[PDB]
Design an enzyme around this catalytic site. Structure first.
Site, PDB file in Angstrom:
ATOM      1  CE  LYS A 149    -103.188  -1.081 -12.300  1.00 45.30           C
ATOM      2  NZ  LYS A 149    -102.642  -2.488 -12.212  1.00 45.30           N
ATOM      3  CB  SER A 193    -102.329  -3.998 -15.533  1.00 46.78           C
ATOM      4  OG  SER A 193    -102.376  -4.544 -14.216  1.00 46.78           O
ATOM      5  CB  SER A 219    -100.558  -6.293 -12.865  1.00 43.12           C
ATOM      6  OG  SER A 219    -100.994  -6.971 -14.054  1.00 43.12           O
TER       7      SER A 219
END
Length: 438
Positions: free
Chosen positions: A75, A150, A174
């Site tokens: 990420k 996210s 997320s």
């Protein structure tokens, strides 16, 4: 039909392929598939191939490690040395991490190779993945719908087969929500079980806050369990379960604070019934269940202070430290409520979200958005409810695929187990997937 992280590593060990071949294969999948998806927005293909050649030198020198040569991404909010970490802020597009995060260092020590990083929403504050530095990420199952957020680019990259392993972050769903929207596997880990060193707001280097965790994402539960053993700060307890026979499940398909679409409910209900047919004892109610409506309010209250770093809008007075200490007392009392609940149950089965992936929204204010649930417009923010139990009380929580809605969009099941039993969550989801195939 792609190789898993474990299968890849076995291939590289067995001779079937070189780390460099596996690393060029992944680059190829990315260049050929990421055009309409836009998930891998930070690329480091040049250094990745150098590290892959090196991983080949280790292999030929007799060395083996559980992820040697395995290409993966991470990420964008997690630091890799030499790579930007903007969290989607224009002002931090050029913030370049100086040192690998702990998670990344752990996985690189297992032999993994980092090809790049995956897209995120601005400030990690949406269930989509869009920002001014890299653009928007699209769901591979329907490009007109959100990949979630996210960790949305991670879920999209896994879903499109680009890489076998990923790693994400979760404070308001997320990990679980992108995993649910894209049809892959995501594990919200127990609070404080994995270090957040390297998951820093750009240009800061302080302490983990409350609520949030990092956790792995993949296409199967085996990769999750491996990735968790390699990244947890201490080795976590091993899975106690081996069969659904007698497993005690609490099925929750209703929340006093959020609605769920019929197709989501039905998907979650069917997963519980498959377990029941392999011998599970599925209950629908218990008097030990904490007041979920109060929980959502305590969670929200605390969430907005954590994200504001205790600062207040000018004109408003901040929360006092003593009041904050009271809020953790509250949190602590609620956690003990779930301890008593888990004396009677091995897992909770519930929805991840009341709907599958929604259409892209350019509206920044959740209060101005809606979600269609059984034909009605319903409030968007209301859906935090489904996500609150595990974040506020700290429990591990798997999101795994259990079906598709009528439009072909994935639907996921949330499996919550007691604090520190992260491996039991992954194990139950593996058995749930078997029961649904049988």
């Amino acid at each position: 039909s792609e190789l898993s992280a474990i299968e890849t590593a076995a291939a590289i060990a067995g001779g079937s392929m070189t780390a460099l071949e596996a690393c060029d294969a992944a680059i190829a999948r990315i260049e050929q598939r990421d055009g309409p998806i836009n998930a891998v927005v930070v690329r480091d293909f040049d250094r990745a191939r150098e590290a892959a050649k090196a991983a080949d030198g280790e292999v030929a020198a007799g060395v083996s490690k559980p992820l040697l040569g395995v290409p993966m991404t991470i990420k964008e909010s997690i630091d890799i040395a030499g790579l930007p970490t903007s969290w989607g802020f224009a002002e931090h597009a050029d913030h370049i991490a100086t040192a690998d995060s702990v998670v990344v260092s752990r996985l690189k020590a297992a032999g993994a190779v980092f090809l790049g990083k995956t897209n995120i929403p601005v400030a990690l504050a949406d269930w989509q993945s869009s920002n001014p530095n890299y653009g928007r990420t699209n769901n591979p199952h329907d490009l007109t719908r959100s990949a979630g957020g996210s960790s949305g680019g991670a879920a999209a990259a896994l879903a499109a087969g680009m890489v076998p392993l990923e790693y994400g972050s979760d404070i308001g769903g997320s990990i679980r929500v992108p995993a649910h929207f894209c049809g892959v596997w995501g594990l919200k880990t127990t609070f404080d079980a994995v270090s957040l060193e390297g998951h820093y707001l750009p240009r800061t280097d302080g302490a983990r806050g409350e609520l949030g965790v990092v956790g792995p994402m993949a296409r199967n539960p085996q990769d999750l369990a491996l990735a968790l053993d390699l990244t947890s700060r201490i080795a976590l307890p091993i899975a106690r379960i081996d069969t659904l026979n007698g497993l005690r499940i609490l099925l929750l398909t209703h929340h006093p604070r959020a609605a769920a679409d019929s197709a989501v409910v039905a998907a979650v209900e069917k997963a519980a019934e498959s377990c029941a047919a392999q011998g599970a004892q599925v209950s629908t109610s218990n008097a030990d269940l904490p007041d979920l409506s109060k929980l959502v309010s305590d969670y929200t209250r605390m969430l907005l202070i954590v994200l504001a770093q205790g600062k207040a809008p000018e004109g408003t007075e901040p929360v006092s430290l003593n009041a904050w200490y009271g809020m953790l007392d509250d949190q602590a009392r609620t956690i003990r409520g779930f301890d008593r609940l888990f004396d009677s149950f091995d897992a909770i089965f519930c929805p991840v979200l009341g709907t599958s992936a929604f259409p892209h929204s350019d509206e920044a204010d959740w209060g101005k958005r809606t979600l269609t649930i059984d034909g009605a417009d319903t409030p968007f923010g209301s859906q935090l409810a489904w996500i609150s139990m595990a974040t506020y009380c700290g429990m591990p929580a798997l999101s795994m695929p259990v079906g598709t809605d009528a439009n072909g969009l994935p639907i996921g099941l949330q499996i919550i187990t007691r604090n520190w039993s992260d491996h039991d969550a992954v194990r139950i989801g593996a058995l749930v997937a078997d029961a649904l195939a049988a």
